[PDB]
Design a binder for this molecule. Structure first.
Ligand SMILES: [Mg+2]
Ligand SMILES: [Mg+2]
Ligand SMILES: [Mg+2]
Ligand SMILES: [Mg+2]
Ligand SMILES: [Mg+2]
Ligand SMILES: [Mg+2]
Ligand SMILES: [Mg+2]
Ligand SMILES: [Mg+2]
Ligand SMILES: [Mg+2]
Ligand SMILES: [Mg+2]
Ligand SMILES: [Mg+2]
Ligand SMILES: [Mg+2]
Ligand SMILES: [Mg+2]
Ligand SMILES: [Mg+2]
Ligand SMILES: [Mg+2]
Ligand SMILES: [Mg+2]
Ligand SMILES: [Mg+2]
Ligand SMILES: [Mg+2]
Ligand SMILES: [Mg+2]
Ligand SMILES: [Mg+2]
Ligand SMILES: [Mg+2]
Ligand SMILES: [Mg+2]
Ligand SMILES: [Mg+2]
Ligand SMILES: [Mg+2]
Ligand SMILES: [Mg+2]
Ligand SMILES: [Mg+2]
Ligand SMILES: [Mg+2]
Ligand SMILES: [Mg+2]
Ligand SMILES: [Mg+2]
Ligand SMILES: [Mg+2]
Ligand SMILES: [Mg+2]
Ligand SMILES: [Mg+2]
Ligand SMILES: [Mg+2]
Ligand SMILES: [Mg+2]
Ligand SMILES: [Mg+2]
Ligand SMILES: [Mg+2]
Ligand SMILES: [Mg+2]
Ligand SMILES: [Mg+2]
Ligand SMILES: [Mg+2]
Ligand SMILES: [Mg+2]
Ligand SMILES: [Mg+2]
Ligand SMILES: [Mg+2]
Ligand SMILES: [Mg+2]
Ligand SMILES: [Mg+2]
Ligand SMILES: [Mg+2]
Ligand SMILES: [Mg+2]
Ligand SMILES: [Mg+2]
Ligand SMILES: [Mg+2]
Lengths: 51, 71, 64, 75
RNA sequence: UUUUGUAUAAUGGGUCAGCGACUUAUAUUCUGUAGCAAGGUUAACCGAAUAGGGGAGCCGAAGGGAAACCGAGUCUUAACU
RNA sequence: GUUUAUUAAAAACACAGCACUGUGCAAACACGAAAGUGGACGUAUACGGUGUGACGCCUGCCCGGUGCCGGGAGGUUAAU
RNA sequence: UGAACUCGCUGUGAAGAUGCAGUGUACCCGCGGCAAGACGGAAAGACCCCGUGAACCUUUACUAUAGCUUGACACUGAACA
RNA sequence: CUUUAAUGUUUGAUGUUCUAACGUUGACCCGUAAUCCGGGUUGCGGACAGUGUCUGGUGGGUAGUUUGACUGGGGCGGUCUCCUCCUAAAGAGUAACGGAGGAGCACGAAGGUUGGCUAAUCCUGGUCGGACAUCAGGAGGUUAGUGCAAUGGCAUAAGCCAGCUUGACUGCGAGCGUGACGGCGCGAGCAGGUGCGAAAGCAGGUCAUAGUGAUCCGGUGGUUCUGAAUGGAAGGGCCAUC
């Protein structure tokens, strides 16, 4: 319960994404982690977005 | 509607002309089969000119080594 | 009359050259974010049916 | 009665004993906390599992100032 | 007969004679056996008919892949020591 | 008075009486895919349904719940 | 009504014995009585349980549906306000 | 654009009147020396009523059904999956309505890495300040701590602070463990592309062990893989995911 789930979408590339969990009540701001896009084959800033 | 023609059953029709309908006439492949493909298997003696038919790279080496030119 | 195939089995299996049946792994439709990637990678490629539960598969889909 | 619950057993312990030849990747000891420690040609997994990193025979030894059971492999 | 176990005081049978229970058809796999063999085989059907025609078809001789597709390889993968 | 013919005759059912309630006549209700019958060739002092059970003394409080009756602005809402 | 050449006892054994062990007693065969036993006869226990058995019955169990009821369209029209 | 006036213009719920459909289990005449029925005259309702198709509500009136198992007989009660210890007989495994306890998550810092630190509890002294807040030393030494139960672990710390970060990464995976299977788990090394450190090296989540459910069905993203005459599409498939 509580901790909802989210869809980290790639900025620089296709619609490839990662899914992770996130406690939305404690942390209001959006995740902007740097992760690997395997379509482009490159590290890219994966911005947070809802399912 | 596609068949796997074995190279051993290639030269069993009419000298060296084996397009599709002539191959079908000898009862090597079924009736309702538009596309077909020659693969490697065993033995060519006479020169066979295949045309209007898909052919495999290993077969193409053999059929040319026997003598007959494809298309 | 002829033996009818268990059609549900016909869709979930496929006959190979030796005689065995390839099938798709389970636990890979949904609830995937919590599953580690190392599982999700190993549940992707097709798998041979074990000899223990082959006799069931041979019976329920005899024609190929 | 507030009892009658128990977990599935794990199958822990030693799998390959002293002198036994093992292949690279084979599990030697599958334990919870590092009761056995990694020596020569042995690694420690995230589950605290001792596994072979080369072909050869298993050697159980006791070494170090604090006196602990090290597992090692020699080809 | 059923049972862990029956002389059992558990079941069944008064006796005799007669009848009374793993069959048949079609598919399929496996073993044997006979034929012929990169071939084997015909169904319906026509037939001076349990001959002989009729190979429509089936099965086999190559698989891999969800599939397009490629094919002694191919799938996976951007690509496989 | 009636009742379990064939193990129960009773305190059970019925009963006259009482109350509620429905029914305005092509009645309500019932049987019947319908036509049509009973109700009744009766007409609210009549008919159906429910409960109670001669007679005498009486029958108190609760409308929150469940049903029923009435009200109709608002919210909600099907087909179209 | 399995067949009987169909005794008592204490013990044993499927755990209450005409049949087993040990022992005690008893000439063969009726007839009239009694009814303790032959777990006597009668009814594949009705009690209890079991079956993903059956039926009827109940309800604010699920699902439907006859009837009852609401509306839209039809049979269905003309004027005005 | 707001706000509204007159006219034309397009429709809408109502009410009153009408008669011609419809109704008439109203009266009379005829088929007919027939309470049926039909027809004709004439009253009374009247576009209501009724009947059909669709449609919401109600509906044990009537059907079809379901209503678990374990169980020291059944019912009542309790339990039913996962994790830890014991039972468990020094490898693994091992039952009972045996004995005790927990879980249905948490966290973008509580993950990663690089550099540095080491606890509990007492004792004495010291402002407010006390048995206990903060400070100083000494004794003790890991009796602590480890996001949450218990077990096994941890100083090379897996414990505790600080800086830069996102390896909680994609494709794989020799070879093992473990299950009847479904599955579950460990995993060196290889390819790409990262971060951390001066580099050797480390990182495929968290000290380990619980935090979870198969299939079908359907949704949401990406992929000319298919795509029924052909070209597209819908629908499938494959990959990501609810
Ligand atoms: Mg043919
Ligand atoms: Mg396959
Ligand atoms: Mg497998
Ligand atoms: Mg156990
Ligand atoms: Mg376990
Ligand atoms: Mg005996
Ligand atoms: Mg007997
Ligand atoms: Mg006897
Ligand atoms: Mg018997
Ligand atoms: Mg008998
Ligand atoms: Mg193939
Ligand atoms: Mg009397
Ligand atoms: Mg009578
Ligand atoms: Mg009687
Ligand atoms: Mg009497
Ligand atoms: Mg009597
Ligand atoms: Mg009426
Ligand atoms: Mg009437
Ligand atoms: Mg009448
Ligand atoms: Mg009474
Ligand atoms: Mg009374
Ligand atoms: Mg009302
Ligand atoms: Mg005795
Ligand atoms: Mg006598
Ligand atoms: Mg007598
Ligand atoms: Mg008896
Ligand atoms: Mg019985
Ligand atoms: Mg059952
Ligand atoms: Mg039932
Ligand atoms: Mg009229
Ligand atoms: Mg009439
Ligand atoms: Mg009448
Ligand atoms: Mg009339
Ligand atoms: Mg008329
Ligand atoms: Mg109407
Ligand atoms: Mg019912
Ligand atoms: Mg039970
Ligand atoms: Mg009990
Ligand atoms: Mg043990
Ligand atoms: Mg042991
Ligand atoms: Mg147990
Ligand atoms: Mg460090
Ligand atoms: Mg850490
Ligand atoms: Mg650097
Ligand atoms: Mg289902
Ligand atoms: Mg589908
Ligand atoms: Mg098309
Ligand atoms: Mg799609």
């Amino acid at each position: 319960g509580i901790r909802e789930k989210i869809k980290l979408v790639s900025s620089a590339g296709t619609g490839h994404f990662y899914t992770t969990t996130k406690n939305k009540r404690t942390k209001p701001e959006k995740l902007e982690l740097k992760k690997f896009d395997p379509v482009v084959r490159q590290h890219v800033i994966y911005k947070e977005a809802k399912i | 509607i596609t068949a796997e023609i074995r190279l051993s059953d290639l030269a069993k029709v009419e000298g060296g002309v084996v397009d599709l309908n002539t191959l079908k006439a000898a009862n090597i492949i079924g009736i309702q089969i538009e596309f077909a493909k020659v693969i490697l298997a065993g033995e060519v003696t006479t020169p066979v000119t295949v045309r209007g038919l898909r052919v495999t790279k290993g077969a193409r080496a053999a059929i040319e080594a026997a003598g007959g030119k494809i298309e | 009359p002829k033996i009818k195939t268990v059609r549900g089995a016909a869709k979930r299996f496929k006959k190979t050259g030796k005689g065995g049946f390839k099938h798709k792994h389970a636990n890979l439709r949904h609830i995937l974010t919590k599953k580690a990637t190392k599982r999700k990678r190993h549940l992707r490629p097709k798998a041979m049916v074990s000899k223990g539960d082959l006799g069931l598969v041979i019976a329920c889909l005899p024609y190929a | 009665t507030r009892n009658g619950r128990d977990s599935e057993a794990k199958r822990l312990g030693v799998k390959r004993f002293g002198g036994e030849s093992v292949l690279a990747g084979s599990i030697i000891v599958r334990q919870r906390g590092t009761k056995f420690h990694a020596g020569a040609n042995v690694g420690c997994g995230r589950d605290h599992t001792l596994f072979a990193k080369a072909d050869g025979k298993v050697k159980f030894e006791v070494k170090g100032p604090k006196n602990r059971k090290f597992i090692s492999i020699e080809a």
